[PDB]
Amino acid sequence: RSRKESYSVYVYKVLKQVHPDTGISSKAMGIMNSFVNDIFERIAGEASRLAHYNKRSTITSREIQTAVRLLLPGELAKHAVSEGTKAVTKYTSA
Amino acid sequence: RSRKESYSVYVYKVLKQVHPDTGISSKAMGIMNSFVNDIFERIAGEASRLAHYNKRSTITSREIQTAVRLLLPGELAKHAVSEGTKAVTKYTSAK
Amino acid sequence: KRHRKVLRDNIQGITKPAIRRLARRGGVKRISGLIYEETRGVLKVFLENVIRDAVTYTEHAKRKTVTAMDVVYALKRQGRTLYGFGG
Amino acid sequence: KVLRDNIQGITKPAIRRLARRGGVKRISGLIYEETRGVLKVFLENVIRDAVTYTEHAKRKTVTAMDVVYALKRQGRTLYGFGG
Amino acid sequence: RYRPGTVALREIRRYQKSTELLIRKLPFQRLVREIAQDFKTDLRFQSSAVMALQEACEAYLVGLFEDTNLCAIHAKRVTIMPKDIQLARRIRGER
Amino acid sequence: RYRPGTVALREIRRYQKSTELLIRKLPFQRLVREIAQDFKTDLRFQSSAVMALQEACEAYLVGLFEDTNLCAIHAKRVTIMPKDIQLARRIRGERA
């Protein structure tokens, strides 16, 4: 195969981390799978246009950080930006 | 001085071919230039997704012909399809 | 031979126990005189300019069966994404 | 021009001829405030989008191209200015 | 007999607190098959496809009925009119 | 003075047969500058940018007024109400 699957293990781990003794249902897994792939082509799709508008072709961390404030609203955008900055800091530290 | 791409000569030739003793204005040229670039990223953008949905990566004449019936309505879609078929036939007949 | 019912559902079935049941979910309380008739007509275009997209998609891949993977791409063009039955 | 001296930029007789272009004959009283509030909200949204765009480009000058791109992203492909 | 004004709200609450299908499956499948036959013959349908079609049609009908009721209740009228649907479609931009 | 029925239609036709700007430029520029200052200071504006902004605002206002008039004229009322604008915004999906 060419690796075309589904987000199930990570979703279950996140659900168990945020809520113990919980789980996902039958159609809920497909709903979350279709929701992940929908925003995956929306955030990454705007970064390409934003890089092409400035005569560039490098989508780094700032290209994804700036795209958060465009798609996400207000408080969720700042929270996602803070989480991404903390993640990139923990990545660059070690 | 890096020049900017603009559709002016072809637009003027088309206007002179469909209407003699006519021309374009000042803002009309920029309006047509912004209109061409708008549909340029709409028709070509759908062909890439249509090719990716079928596990392919070849955008040929059929990928653009089928995208006409999706963006264009009814009579204009059939007219554009006929024009494209006649153009590709004249191209394949003589190079 | 063949059955004489070659009408293939002349846009019927969805009548009083269906239109009223669908309107009761939104918030409609009473129904006037007409109301219907055109209720079965406004749903005709919703299947005319959507199923044609699925047929045109299946015609590109040299197929003949409109699966669930092609019905979600047609609704995404109009602006009504559905999660669950598509995938 | 930084206090409430510019928010009340929409008058009352000037907005009468503005609505007459669409086909409005008679307006009301609270329209001068409701339309101003709606225009303020929409302008805040468009200005926020343009600021996010000019921050992506690391620029401090809101050009017409960024405004056109933001309007197209919102759902209004404006023609004329830009490209 | 029950005084008119309580059975309607009870039925509304009962149908809102439940997630059961209201339209049938075979008539809708025959309808979409007849519609598909108008464009190209020799066409089949699946189960998940017609299920998603029925779900989308139900959602669109619910939204249209809610918009019609919200437009009619603002004109001092508890009932809706056949012109209210066309009004809502013209405002939303459905044509 | 006297109430009419013909001067309104004449003004409507005159303003529809012309493509002249109705809102000023300097007040709109000061307004958008004050709005931009609320997010980040030290910001400038151009001419084509504020022109496109004024054109988009004029188109949006014309569309909103047309929708409000079409919603008000269908309820046996020649005038519009302040709630009709909120109704049109709720139907179009601008606020909720």
Added chain:
Amino acid sequence: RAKAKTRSSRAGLQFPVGRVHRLLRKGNYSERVGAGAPVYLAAVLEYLTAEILELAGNAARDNKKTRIIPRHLQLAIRNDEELNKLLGRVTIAQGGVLPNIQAVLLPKK
């Protein structure tokens, strides 16, 4: 490197088939594009370009302005049922739409 048979006119369209395809690759779409794709790109997209140009001058005849101006370009799209229903994400600057004061907007009728 022989004759001056440019790719811009190698097919048979007024739009440059050789240059409009130089921009076709400037969009990060799919890779291997067929020979008929640039021909189909400058034929069905130039149609919408040509249909709006020739109709704004016709709208200028009622305004006594002859030449296509930006104001007539928006009315050129709403001149037939094939061009108005065609474009959805198109809003020309000036315009001045047709005053649709029908018989209904007129006294009764």
Added chain:
Amino acid sequence: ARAKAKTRSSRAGLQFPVGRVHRLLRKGNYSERVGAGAPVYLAAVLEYLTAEILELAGNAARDNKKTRIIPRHLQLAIRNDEELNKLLGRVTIAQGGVLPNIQAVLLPKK
């Protein structure tokens, strides 16, 4: 030759995958050059969004004495938050229904 080769939590501190995001973004014809520390941001954003959605779904499901997230609970939790309503406004979750909202004029008042 090498050493302990210790890691953080997984590879950056997130449970969401990182090797598939960079693969789907590079092979997705999005850009000819993809950054190294770029998919981590999108992975963290998606993880935070999924965690918030799952927490809202669990909070909505716990009210009905059911510790299992069903699509109805997801539809009730999505159509309740103000920040999540503006993002998924055009999303119609199948088998979710609507919200119990009845107009005050329809109720038998005075």
Added chain:
Amino acid sequence: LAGNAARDNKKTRIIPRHLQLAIRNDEELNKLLGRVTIAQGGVLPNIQAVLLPKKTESHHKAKGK
């Protein structure tokens, strides 16, 4: 204002409970009669939030015994 509240409980009589529920309902009527206490009236039926301290009810134990 009291008769409409009395008709809600299927009672065509004006009992002191109806008057107490009607006075404590309107804003102006409550602002005018804020210190007046009606005999045999009662408190308006209203609960209070922030009462459960476990809310989330997480799994402090384990799935495997």
Added chain:
DNA sequence: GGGTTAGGGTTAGGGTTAGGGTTAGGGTTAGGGTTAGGGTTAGGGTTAGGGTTAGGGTTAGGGTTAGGGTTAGGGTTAGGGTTAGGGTTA
């Protein structure tokens, strides 16, 4: 009429390794944004008119809320007599 004790029945929950794509740094080295002499574009003051915008008054001057024709849209009917669900294969 809906929550609940008994009871399975699909349907959730935890490794088990099986191992195979997938991301990661110095050996390079790179050409774009700064940082660099000319050349540009927005912002702060200056001046005088003339067309645009605040304000009463007025007009008896034109859209607009309580009674009361009907006709038109609900709840039961209660059988019953046509259709819609679910298990069979080939």
Added chain:
DNA sequence: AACCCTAACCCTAACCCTAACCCTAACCCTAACCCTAACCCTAACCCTAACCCTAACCCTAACCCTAACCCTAACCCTAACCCTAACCCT
């Protein structure tokens, strides 16, 4: 897809209220005509502070790196919510 049963839920049809629609009565909300009196920018006239090119060198760009780990529904299975008897007020 079109191929005999199923067999009990599901879809027409009737009398009596609420509700939709028209006619007045009279207050009260709403457009311009020549008086109102300072008044109002935008059209002309300057005079301001680092942003655009500018690009020669400088210190990072993911590229193939090829050894770890993760890993996923089935595993043959078990973890929640079941569905008929039993059952809280209507």
